[PDB]
Design an enzyme around this catalytic site. Structure first.
Site, short mmCIF file in Angstrom:
data_model
loop_
_atom_site.label_atom_id
_atom_site.label_comp_id
_atom_site.label_asym_id
_atom_site.label_seq_id
_atom_site.Cartn_x
_atom_site.Cartn_y
_atom_site.Cartn_z
CG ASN A 252 91.55 -2.01 -31.12
OD1 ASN A 252 92.19 -2.55 -30.22
ND2 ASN A 252 91.91 -0.85 -31.66
CE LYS B 24 96.86 -0.99 -27.57
NZ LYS B 24 97.42 -1.85 -28.65
CG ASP C 62 90.47 8.00 -27.01
OD1 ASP C 62 89.35 8.13 -27.58
OD2 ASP C 62 91.27 8.95 -26.85
#
Lengths: 272, 272, 272, 272
Positions: free
Chosen positions: D26, D60, D238
């Site tokens: 990620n 992000k 998350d």
């Protein structure tokens, strides 16, 4: 964790065992067609090696009108099944609607089904419970998987402790179904790990019947519930969507490479 | 375009008329409570001016277990209703499950209901059709509004041509309902403009019972279907969600300012 | 529990106060039309008594093709707004897409909007935060109401503590929206009771624009966000669905009888 | 009907060819971990025979707060990728957020991704179009499959005609996703039969990561997009849900028996 087993005779429906194809037809028109429907199933099964239970309805408590074709009738409907049974050496599975029907049909068939929209009809559940003959519980489109546990209990309670769970998809907005591949697993859990089977045709309300059925199998299911008709184009009425019969073998050949090749995997735990 | 009218006696249920409150209770426990439930409704109605039809079930063909409380029973259930009727001068409405019940109840009540999960049960629809006594069709959570037309037809066909449509919301993923305020309109269209009523309590499976009920009314509905219990905290079991009775008047006062104040609008056409 | 207040000047947006109509238009074509759009709004507002903030976009970072009409442009778009402002004595609200735009527009308008699909774009949120000028947060169709709390926080954090929440409905299967009338309440809670407004036109992607807008108002909202065009039939392109301008007054007259008549209710607690 | 081909170098992404695993991680924390993440992928791939493209984000633009960890930064993020590339002989794929980033990253990586919530951001699409370097279009949860055609066009138009379609599931009520196994097929059609890949981890927001991934593959997809972390328990923050790295091989072994064994089927037509 071992799987449950609900043998309907010399057959063993389970989650870790090879899938059991509950193939068949929708409504029970006439014999020349019915027994013909069995002809190809019955053949391909043995020919390819696959447990088989024919399926046909002897009534449609619902359609799109009153002055419509009910069906052979509860009575004349049982006579129908009898014949084919002895004629091929396979078990029959049919859905019941009113408490009564339960017991009468419990003596002719080997697998009794419970209509989805009736899934939560105690009077009937308690009723169908007596027989103690293998039961297949169709899963309503409007019911969350985890809710399946209670329906299995209310049955055990009444008596019968041999149940099966059938998934036909979930409601996705108006007039649309979608199959939560993740329901099956969630469905084993709460169901004392009862046998879970995917109803493809009646999850599709099509050249999709295949692709969809592949994904279900690759999950690891007890088996399939399917329906086929000789000419899927003319008698193309409404309700579920059936398979172009002739395509039974090439299709079922696919499932075997799935069912088998997947039923034989070293249990994996992506959990940790 | 004028609205349909399905008078259940000296009452006129319609879409352009003042809303008809089909208030009442869920299960039929005992009289001291039932007739008490009517006491406050009956009072507030006259006191505020609102058509009223009590509602209570004499059976629960479904719950969360077999060794559960069925209900007064089809027989003992009718005896119950009788009394209150003469005791207050209001009509009763109760749901039937098996064809039989239909006719027997058709003589005691003024409004017969059809269970949602049975919405598409021909045998029963054709059955309940005979009576010809006002029918209220609960709308399944898994059925698109426009589909309501056929269910209204299969009824007209059998005979009965006096129907009502009740909305209880739609399925929103797993274990959740949401009310499409736009269903009502879509629901009038295909239903020969039959009377449409919103079932709030059994659209909420709460300090929401209100806000939700306000939005429905501001749409222009035939009326409301509600349920209240003296102590909504203890007998707080499952199924729908009931109103804290005492709050009947202050609440129903709200609806009137809606129902009335909205039922009297110069028809608007944002179409063009 | 008292409501929050986010005054955009001499205007007070709140939940218990009369609704504030954030009426206006979609794209910013030309002036003769724009200022014309304001003409009727501006008039009807004063004439009927309703807070008003014009709304128009000076860009469409998205449509159905590249060789499409961007818009006046960030630069030429601000020049546009200027004029009308002084020409009528009302505030303007426009959406920004890239961090930059934020500050530049923060000096011309009185209410800056945040595009739904950008709802969770920190770089921008933190950016738009500086201005400290009233912000309206469009609520994505794919985001649960209760999730709104965090988006309001990430803003307060950056600086700006004057926010508004706009609901445009939720995704109901493929290609369909439905408005959860119950979102609003759930939306006040987690949002420190910030002002909640319902975007009807862009909840309807129609003779429904009305009925829907009625139900929202009867819930008790800070106000409405609407869009109207002279001829809703020709320029009938895609995106939201606009109101047939001429129908402003008769429609807004409806809202007032709701907004007002409901904003003045003795707080009810169906809770207990 | 033959499939499209969008080779990202010596690799060929297509629908009828063996699946291409776009495995990776990620966020881009540090190297000792990143290059470690590649270590096992890179190994298992060659060891089992599977096309591979590492994947990691260098930013992000969204999380759960402002005072959060942006990422390495657009600049320092590219430096990162460089190294590993030469260190293993595999291609890298990373998502861009602002038009700018596009070109700069177009020179370092071999596969550029487009963030789902930005899926319909023309300015960016037209922007990312210039590069002409392989593009992967994440499919928003709130967008119907058939809508994918236009997004592919607006890209071709700008220039780039080498695109990929990634499915991450659809919205199922509030806070829930479900993967429509039937989207893939519908997704090939309108996309000039472009390559379709299933993003499992970011379809699961778990011992499900597996079962789900099996069903997708059995449909016949271009490939998989996955994410794994050494300890899925602690850094258990998350966003998506990652795979317990160590379980790469046993898992990817499963996919191969699917991908391969299914990619080699005599085209079936359950249509007729």
């Amino acid at each position: 964790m071992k799987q449950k087993v609900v043998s309907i005779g010399d057959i063993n429906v389970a989650n870790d065992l090879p899938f059991v194809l509950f193939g068949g037809m929708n409504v029970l028109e006439s014999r020349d067609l019915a027994m013909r429907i069995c002809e190809h199933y019955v053949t391909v099964t043995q020919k390819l090696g696959i447990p088989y239970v024919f399926k046909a309805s002897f009534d449609k408590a619902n359609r799109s009108s009153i002055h419509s074709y009910r069906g052979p009738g509860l009575e004349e409907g049982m006579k129908i099944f009898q014949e084919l049974k002895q004629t091929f050496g396979v078990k029959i599975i049919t859905d019941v609607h009113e408490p009564s029907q339960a017991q009468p049909v419990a003596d002719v068939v080997d697998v009794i089904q419970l209509p989805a929209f009736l899934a939560r009809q105690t009077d009937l559940v308690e009723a169908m419970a007596k027989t103690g003959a293998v039961i297949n519980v169709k899963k309503p489109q409007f019911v969350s998987p985890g809710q399946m546990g209670n329906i299995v209990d209310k049955f055990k309670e009444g008596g019968n402790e041999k149940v099966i769970l059938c998934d036909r998809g979930a409601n996705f907005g108006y007039d649309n179904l979608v199959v939560d591949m993740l329901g099956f697993s969630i469905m084993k859990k709460v169901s004392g790990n009862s046998p879970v089977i995917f109803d493809v045709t009646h999850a599709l309300q099509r050249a999709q019947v295949a692709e969809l059925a592949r994904a279900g199998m690759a999950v690891g299911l007890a088996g399939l519930f399917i329906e086929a008709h000789p000419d899927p184009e003319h008698a193309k009425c409404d309700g579920p969507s059936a398979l172009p019969l002739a395509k039974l073998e090439p299709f079922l050949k696919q499932m075997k490479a799935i069912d088998d090749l997947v039923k034989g995997f070293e249990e994996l735990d992506t959990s940790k």
